[PDB]
């Protein structure tokens, strides 16, 4: 009932990179130097908005965000005052780097000068401010804001949509700058450290980023205003991201397998996240990566193997009869692909009942989600 223990993930530090595979990663050094540069720029910028002695404004709004940035409303809705205001809110909360934080309703107030971009604790009473997820692609962050911005733009007059376009381009420049030298993407950028520095597939983070750049490269969904020079970069970026997905797929000696929520930017092997999230193949995140690859027009054999492989392991590992409909363990043992679970105490188990109910509840360790990649593979194998 207790497989092993969960070790912490490894931050992408200069020492991990100092192991230069012969002037091969002078790229990663530059990458970190830019990350650090931007980070300071971010903090100094917010600080510059406050006046000496001026009390901190209250923390910004928090809660479900994506639902305040609907991307499927009718065209007309994007010309309304309601949509224009969501855009203004969006434009006001973009970080100097060009990104956005998560869990922030954008239908309320505009960010006040000196007010945090994403969120912080109330400064109870009786410049060192909180800095977590200040530019993330988790929970659909950044990607959603850029898509919304583009919808509004596409339904307004060119002469009346400069701010939204400009914030959109900053957002696209943000996603381009944060991409790893090997095409992957970190959950937070500028780099915050820890498992946040891992190539993040978790919550569709990387897939969403790649689909966004793909669309930009194509000039669709309202990105027709994007300069060709930048659309070319988004294309190259999307190709790099696809490659990454390919060079990261877990190969069980000969066979191909799933992917797992996060991978080390240098090791490429599945790494860990939180105390209760050990390095391990992920059913749900694999199904998403698969659905994404099956979307590719004229896949290379490399991409063809990846799809066929992942889809297979998704079938070698299923569930008889949380029962009636096909099942999958959120996580599967890299060694010996079998259901795996964990707890807030770094201990890896092989039974949900061997976990604190606090973790046994809320968090979902089993799921039917993967099925989506199966029905998809069917029609996909044909034209390939
Ligand atoms: Cl087409
Ligand atoms: Hg990669």
């Amino acid at each position: 009932a207790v497989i092993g223990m969960n070790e912490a993930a490894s931050a992408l530090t200069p020492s991990r990179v100092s192991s230069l595979p012969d002037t091969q990663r002078a790229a990663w050094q530059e990458y970190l130097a830019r990350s650090e540069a931007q980070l300071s720029r971010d903090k100094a910028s917010l600080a510059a908005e406050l006046a000496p002695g001026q009390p901190l404004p209250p923390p910004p709004a928090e809660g479900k965000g994506a639902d305040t940035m609907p991307l499927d409303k009718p065209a007309a809705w994007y010309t309304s005052k309601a949509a224009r205001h969501v855009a203004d809110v969006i434009v006001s909360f973009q970080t100097p780097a060009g990104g956005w934080g998560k869990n922030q309703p954008r239908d309320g107030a505009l960010r006040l000068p000196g007010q945090h971009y994403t969120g912080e604790n109330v400064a109870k009473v009786k410049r060192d401010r909180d800095w977590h997820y200040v530019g993330t692609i988790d929970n659909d962050a950044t990607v959603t804001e850029i898509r919304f911005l583009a919808q509004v733009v596409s339904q307004l007059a060119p002469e009346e949509a400069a701010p939204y376009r400009d914030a959109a381009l900053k957002g696209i420049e943000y996603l381009l700058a944060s991409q790893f030298p090997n095409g992957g993407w970190p959950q937070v950028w500028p780099l915050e450290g820890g498992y946040h520095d891992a190539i993040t597939y978790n919550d569709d983070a990387l897939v969403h980023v790649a689909e966004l750049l793909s669309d930009i490269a194509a000039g669709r969904d309202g990105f027709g205003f994007v300069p060709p020079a930048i659309r070319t970069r988004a294309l190259e970026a999307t190709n790099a991201a696809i490659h990454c997905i390919v060079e990261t797929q877990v190969v069980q000696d000969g066979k191909r397998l799933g992917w797992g929520q996060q991978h080390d930017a240098l090791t490429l092997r599945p790494t860990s996240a939180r105390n209760f999230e050990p390095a391990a193949l992920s059913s749900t995140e694999s199904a998403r990566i698969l659905l994404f690859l099956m979307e590719i027009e004229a896949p290379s054999d490399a991409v063809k193997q990846a799809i066929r492989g992942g889809v297979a392991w998704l079938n070698t590992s299923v569930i008889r009869d949380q029962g009636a409909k096909p099942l999958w363990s959120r996580f599967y043992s890299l060694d010996g692909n079998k259901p795996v679970f964990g707890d807030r105490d770094k201990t890896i188990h092989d039974d949900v009942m061997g976990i604190s109910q606090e973790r046994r509840t809320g968090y979902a360790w089993y799921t039917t989600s993967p099925q989506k990649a199966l029905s998809a593979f069917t029609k996909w194998e044909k034209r390939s």
Side-chain angles (χ1 to χ4, degrees):
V2 184
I3 302 178
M5 292 204 93
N6 181 191
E7 322 295 343
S10 291
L12 178 59
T13 64
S15 68
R16 301 273 306 300
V17 168
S18 65
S19 307
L20 292 161
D22 303 306
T23 51
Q24 177 272 292
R25 67 179 58 156
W28 289 89
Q29 276 183 47
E30 287 168 296
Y31 180 80
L32 298 174
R34 301 209 311 283
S35 185
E36 292 298 302
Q38 195 52 57
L39 215 199
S40 295
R41 216 133 38 183
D42 280 5
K43 293 180 177 171
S45 188
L46 181 66
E49 296 175 355
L50 282 170
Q54 171 181 183
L56 290 184
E62 64 181 303
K64 285 189 175 178
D67 64 7
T68 57
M69 302 176 288
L71 298 180
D72 66 323
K73 303 304 287 291
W77 192 72
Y78 295 94
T79 70
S80 72
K81 308 290 191 175
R84 184 71 175 270
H85 174 262
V86 167
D88 291 346
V89 165
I90 283 169
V91 168
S92 60
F93 272 103
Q94 187 171 39
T95 72
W100 286 272
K102 70 183 184 191
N103 306 150
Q104 289 171 266
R106 333 245 66 155
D107 72 327
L110 303 173
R111 189 178 66 85
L112 286 311
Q115 181 177 48
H116 205 95
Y117 310 108
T118 57
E120 47 171 25
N121 291 298
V122 175
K124 298 180 178 180
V125 176
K126 191 170 184 174
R127 192 62 282 179
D128 186 12
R129 299 176 72 168
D130 304 330
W131 218 264
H132 301 300
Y133 295 71
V134 186
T136 182
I137 61 176
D138 175 42
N139 278 38
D140 301 345
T142 307
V143 167
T144 301
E145 279 90 345
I146 293 174
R147 281 185 175 294
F148 192 85
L149 239 25
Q151 279 308 302
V152 170
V153 169
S154 72
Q155 303 299 133
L156 292 178
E159 69 264 28
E160 82 188 319
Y164 312 121
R165 277 201 303 276
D166 294 341
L169 269 5
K170 282 166 186 159
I172 294 171
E173 304 278 28
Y174 170 90
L175 297 177
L176 282 175
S178 64
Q179 179 172 42
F180 290 151
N182 64 308
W185 263 288
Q187 165 176 291
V188 172
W189 187 91
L191 292 175
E192 177 167 302
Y195 71 88
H196 301 300
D197 288 22
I199 294 170
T200 316
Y201 288 125
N202 174 46
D203 205 12
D204 264 300
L206 191 154
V207 172
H208 287 338
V209 174
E211 294 174 317
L212 175 52
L213 282 339
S214 200
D215 291 342
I216 300 181
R220 295 179 179 174
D221 310 297
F223 294 106
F225 68 86
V226 180
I230 302 175
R231 292 177 55 190
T232 297
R233 297 175 60 200
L235 177 57
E236 303 178 313
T238 305
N239 294 306
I242 299 183
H243 189 204
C244 176
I245 293 182
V246 166
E247 307 288 53
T248 53
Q249 176 158 40
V250 172
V251 288
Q252 200 73 300
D253 312 306
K255 294 290 184 180
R256 303 287 185 175
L257 302 181
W259 276 268
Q261 296 188 183
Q262 326 82 31
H263 288 233
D264 190 74
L266 307 165
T267 276
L268 292 188
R269 299 196 88 170
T271 193
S272 58
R274 281 176 296 193
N275 291 329
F276 58 88
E277 308 186 308
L281 255 53
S282 175
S283 62
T284 31
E285 300 306 342
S286 286
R288 302 177 180 189
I289 297 178
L290 296 172
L291 289 169
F292 175 71
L293 294 180
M294 290 188 255
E295 220 79 304
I296 298 172
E297 184 206 65
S300 64
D301 276 83
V303 175
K304 289 192 171 188
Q305 301 185 305
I307 302 184
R308 296 158 177 163
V311 177
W313 105 284
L314 263 177
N315 274 179
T316 67
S317 58
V318 195
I319 292 297
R320 304 108 300 176
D321 286 297
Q322 301 178 305
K325 303 177 60 57
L327 267 185
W328 279 275
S329 171
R330 172 75 181 181
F331 297 109
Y332 285 86
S333 168
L334 300 180
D335 182 301
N337 294 285
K338 58 202 173 183
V340 177
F341 318 75
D343 207 353
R344 293 179 174 291
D345 70 325
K346 293 165 163 290
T347 67
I348 307 171
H349 310 297
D350 45 292
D351 58 303
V352 288
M353 294 306 270
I355 296 177
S356 61
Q357 191 156 66
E358 190 294 302
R359 293 290 52 178
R360 189 162 56 193
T361 295
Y363 199 77
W365 301 85
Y366 286 85
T367 181
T368 64
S369 301
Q371 179 58 56
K372 284 294 178 62
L374 300 182
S375 302
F377 172 66
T378 304
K379 300 184 174 186
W380 177 86
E381 183 64 74
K382 299 192 60 57
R383 187 191 306 188
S384 300

Coordinates of all heavy atoms in Angstrom, one line a residue, residues 179-216:
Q179 N 9.4 30.6 -24.0 CA 9.6 29.2 -24.6 C 11.0 28.8 -24.4 O 12.0 29.5 -24.7 CB 9.2 29.2 -26.1 CG 9.4 27.8 -26.7 CD 8.9 27.7 -28.1 OE1 9.0 28.7 -28.9 NE2 8.2 26.6 -28.5
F180 N 11.2 27.5 -23.9 CA 12.5 27.0 -23.7 C 13.4 26.8 -25.0 O 12.8 26.8 -26.1 CB 12.4 25.6 -23.0 CG 11.9 25.6 -21.6 CD1 11.2 24.6 -21.1 CD2 12.2 26.7 -20.8 CE1 10.8 24.6 -19.8 CE2 11.8 26.8 -19.5 CZ 11.1 25.7 -19.0
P181 N 14.7 26.7 -24.8 CA 15.5 26.5 -26.0 C 15.2 25.3 -26.8 O 15.4 25.2 -28.0 CB 16.9 26.5 -25.4 CG 16.8 27.4 -24.2 CD 15.5 27.0 -23.6
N182 N 14.6 24.3 -26.1 CA 14.2 23.1 -26.7 C 12.7 23.0 -27.1 O 12.1 22.0 -27.3 CB 14.5 21.9 -25.9 CG 13.8 21.8 -24.6 OD1 13.8 22.8 -23.8 ND2 13.2 20.7 -24.3
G183 N 12.1 24.2 -27.1 CA 10.6 24.3 -27.5 C 9.6 24.2 -26.4 O 8.4 24.5 -26.6
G184 N 10.0 23.7 -25.2 CA 9.0 23.5 -24.2 C 8.6 24.8 -23.5 O 9.0 25.8 -23.9
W185 N 7.7 24.6 -22.5 CA 7.2 25.8 -21.8 C 7.1 25.6 -20.3 O 6.6 24.5 -19.9 CB 5.8 26.2 -22.3 CG 5.9 27.3 -23.3 CD1 6.1 28.6 -23.0 CD2 5.7 27.2 -24.7 NE1 6.2 29.4 -24.2 CE2 5.9 28.5 -25.2 CE3 5.4 26.2 -25.6 CZ2 5.8 28.8 -26.6 CZ3 5.3 26.4 -26.9 CH2 5.5 27.7 -27.4
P186 N 7.4 26.6 -19.5 CA 7.4 26.5 -18.0 C 6.0 27.0 -17.6 O 5.3 27.8 -18.4 CB 8.5 27.5 -17.6 CG 8.4 28.6 -18.7 CD 8.2 27.7 -19.9
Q187 N 5.5 26.6 -16.5 CA 4.2 26.9 -16.0 C 4.1 28.4 -15.6 O 3.0 29.0 -15.7 CB 3.8 26.1 -14.8 CG 2.7 26.6 -13.9 CD 2.3 25.6 -12.8 OE1 1.8 24.5 -13.1 NE2 2.6 26.0 -11.6
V188 N 5.2 29.0 -15.2 CA 5.3 30.4 -14.8 C 6.6 31.0 -15.4 O 7.6 30.3 -15.5 CB 5.4 30.5 -13.2 CG1 5.7 31.9 -12.8 CG2 4.1 30.0 -12.6
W189 N 6.4 32.3 -15.8 CA 7.6 33.0 -16.4 C 7.3 34.5 -16.3 O 6.2 34.9 -16.6 CB 7.7 32.6 -17.9 CG 8.9 33.2 -18.5 CD1 10.2 32.6 -18.6 CD2 9.1 34.4 -19.1 NE1 11.1 33.4 -19.2 CE2 10.4 34.6 -19.5 CE3 8.2 35.5 -19.3 CZ2 10.9 35.7 -20.1 CZ3 8.7 36.7 -19.9 CH2 10.0 36.8 -20.3
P190 N 8.3 35.3 -15.9 CA 9.7 34.8 -15.6 C 9.7 33.7 -14.6 O 8.8 33.6 -13.7 CB 10.3 36.1 -15.0 CG 9.7 37.2 -15.9 CD 8.2 36.7 -15.9
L191 N 10.8 32.9 -14.7 CA 10.9 31.7 -13.8 C 10.8 32.0 -12.3 O 11.4 32.9 -11.8 CB 12.3 31.1 -14.1 CG 12.5 30.4 -15.4 CD1 13.9 29.9 -15.5 CD2 11.5 29.2 -15.6
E192 N 9.9 31.2 -11.7 CA 9.6 31.3 -10.3 C 10.4 30.3 -9.5 O 10.5 30.4 -8.3 CB 8.1 31.2 -10.0 CG 7.7 31.2 -8.6 CD 6.2 31.3 -8.5 OE1 5.7 32.3 -9.0 OE2 5.6 30.5 -7.9
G193 N 10.9 29.3 -10.2 CA 11.6 28.2 -9.5 C 10.8 27.0 -9.2 O 9.6 27.0 -9.5
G194 N 11.4 25.9 -8.6 CA 10.6 24.7 -8.3 C 10.0 24.0 -9.5 O 10.5 24.1 -10.6
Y195 N 9.0 23.2 -9.2 CA 8.4 22.5 -10.3 C 7.7 23.4 -11.3 O 7.2 22.9 -12.4 CB 7.3 21.5 -9.7 CG 6.1 22.1 -9.2 CD1 5.0 22.4 -10.0 CD2 6.0 22.5 -7.8 CE1 3.8 23.0 -9.5 CE2 4.9 23.1 -7.3 CZ 3.8 23.3 -8.1 OH 2.6 23.9 -7.6
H196 N 7.6 24.6 -11.0 CA 7.0 25.6 -12.0 C 8.0 25.8 -13.2 O 7.5 26.3 -14.2 CB 6.8 27.0 -11.3 CG 6.0 26.9 -10.0 ND1 4.7 26.5 -10.1 CD2 6.2 27.2 -8.8 CE1 4.2 26.5 -8.9 NE2 5.1 26.9 -8.0
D197 N 9.2 25.4 -13.0 CA 10.2 25.5 -14.0 C 10.2 24.3 -15.0 O 11.1 24.2 -15.9 CB 11.6 25.6 -13.4 CG 11.8 27.0 -12.8 OD1 10.8 27.7 -12.5 OD2 13.0 27.4 -12.6
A198 N 9.3 23.3 -14.7 CA 9.2 22.1 -15.5 C 8.4 22.3 -16.8 O 7.5 23.2 -16.9 CB 8.6 21.0 -14.7
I199 N 8.7 21.5 -17.8 CA 8.0 21.6 -19.1 C 6.6 21.2 -18.6 O 6.3 20.0 -18.4 CB 8.5 20.6 -20.1 CG1 9.9 21.0 -20.5 CG2 7.6 20.6 -21.3 CD1 10.6 20.0 -21.4
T200 N 5.7 22.2 -18.5 CA 4.3 21.9 -18.0 C 3.2 21.5 -19.0 O 2.7 22.3 -19.8 CB 3.8 23.1 -17.2 OG1 4.9 23.6 -16.4 CG2 2.6 22.8 -16.4
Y201 N 2.8 20.2 -18.9 CA 1.7 19.7 -19.8 C 0.4 19.9 -18.9 O -0.7 20.0 -19.4 CB 1.9 18.3 -20.1 CG 3.0 18.1 -21.2 CD1 4.1 17.2 -20.9 CD2 3.0 18.8 -22.4 CE1 5.1 17.1 -21.9 CE2 4.0 18.6 -23.3 CZ 5.1 17.8 -23.0 OH 6.1 17.7 -24.0
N202 N 0.7 19.8 -17.6 CA -0.4 19.9 -16.6 C -1.4 21.0 -16.9 O -1.1 22.1 -17.1 CB 0.3 20.1 -15.2 CG -0.8 20.3 -14.1 OD1 -1.8 19.6 -14.0 ND2 -0.5 21.3 -13.3
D203 N -2.7 20.6 -16.9 CA -3.9 21.4 -17.1 C -3.9 22.0 -18.5 O -4.6 23.0 -18.8 CB -3.8 22.6 -16.1 CG -5.2 23.2 -15.8 OD1 -6.2 22.5 -16.3 OD2 -5.4 24.2 -15.2
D204 N -3.3 21.3 -19.5 CA -3.3 21.7 -20.9 C -2.5 22.9 -21.1 O -2.5 23.5 -22.2 CB -4.7 21.9 -21.4 CG -5.3 20.8 -22.1 OD1 -4.7 20.3 -23.1 OD2 -6.4 20.3 -21.6
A205 N -1.7 23.3 -20.1 CA -0.9 24.5 -20.3 C -0.1 24.6 -21.6 O -0.3 25.5 -22.4 CB 0.1 24.6 -19.1
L206 N 0.8 23.6 -21.9 CA 1.6 23.6 -23.1 C 0.8 23.4 -24.4 O 1.1 24.0 -25.4 CB 2.7 22.6 -23.0 CG 3.8 22.7 -24.1 CD1 5.1 22.1 -23.6 CD2 3.3 21.9 -25.4
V207 N -0.2 22.6 -24.3 CA -1.1 22.3 -25.5 C -1.8 23.6 -25.9 O -1.9 24.0 -27.1 CB -2.1 21.2 -25.2 CG1 -3.1 21.1 -26.4 CG2 -1.4 19.9 -25.0
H208 N -2.4 24.3 -24.9 CA -3.1 25.6 -25.2 C -2.2 26.6 -25.8 O -2.6 27.3 -26.7 CB -3.6 26.2 -23.9 CG -4.8 25.4 -23.3 ND1 -5.6 24.6 -24.1 CD2 -5.4 25.4 -22.1 CE1 -6.6 24.1 -23.4 NE2 -6.5 24.6 -22.1
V209 N -0.9 26.7 -25.3 CA 0.1 27.6 -25.9 C 0.4 27.3 -27.3 O 0.4 28.2 -28.2 CB 1.4 27.6 -25.0 CG1 2.4 28.5 -25.7 CG2 1.1 28.1 -23.6
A210 N 0.6 26.1 -27.6 CA 0.9 25.6 -29.0 C -0.3 25.8 -29.9 O 0.0 26.1 -31.1 CB 1.4 24.2 -28.9
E211 N -1.5 25.6 -29.4 CA -2.6 25.8 -30.3 C -2.8 27.3 -30.6 O -3.2 27.7 -31.7 CB -3.9 25.2 -29.7 CG -3.8 23.7 -29.5 CD -5.0 23.1 -28.8 OE1 -5.4 23.7 -27.7 OE2 -5.5 22.1 -29.2
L212 N -2.5 28.2 -29.6 CA -2.6 29.6 -29.8 C -1.6 30.0 -30.9 O -2.0 30.7 -31.8 CB -2.3 30.3 -28.5 CG -2.3 31.9 -28.6 CD1 -3.6 32.3 -29.3 CD2 -2.2 32.5 -27.2
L213 N -0.3 29.7 -30.7 CA 0.7 30.1 -31.7 C 0.3 29.5 -33.0 O 0.6 30.1 -34.1 CB 2.1 29.6 -31.2 CG 2.8 30.4 -30.2 CD1 2.3 31.8 -30.1 CD2 2.7 29.7 -28.9
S214 N -0.2 28.3 -33.0 CA -0.6 27.7 -34.3 C -1.6 28.6 -35.0 O -1.3 29.0 -36.2 CB -1.2 26.3 -34.1 OG -1.1 25.5 -35.2
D215 N -2.6 28.9 -34.3 CA -3.7 29.8 -34.9 C -3.1 31.2 -35.3 O -3.5 31.7 -36.4 CB -4.8 30.0 -33.9 CG -5.6 28.8 -33.7 OD1 -5.5 27.8 -34.5 OD2 -6.4 28.7 -32.7
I216 N -2.2 31.7 -34.6 CA -1.6 33.0 -34.9 C -0.8 32.8 -36.2 O -0.9 33.6 -37.1 CB -0.6 33.5 -33.8 CG1 -1.4 33.6 -32.5 CG2 0.1 34.8 -34.2 CD1 -0.6 34.1 -31.3

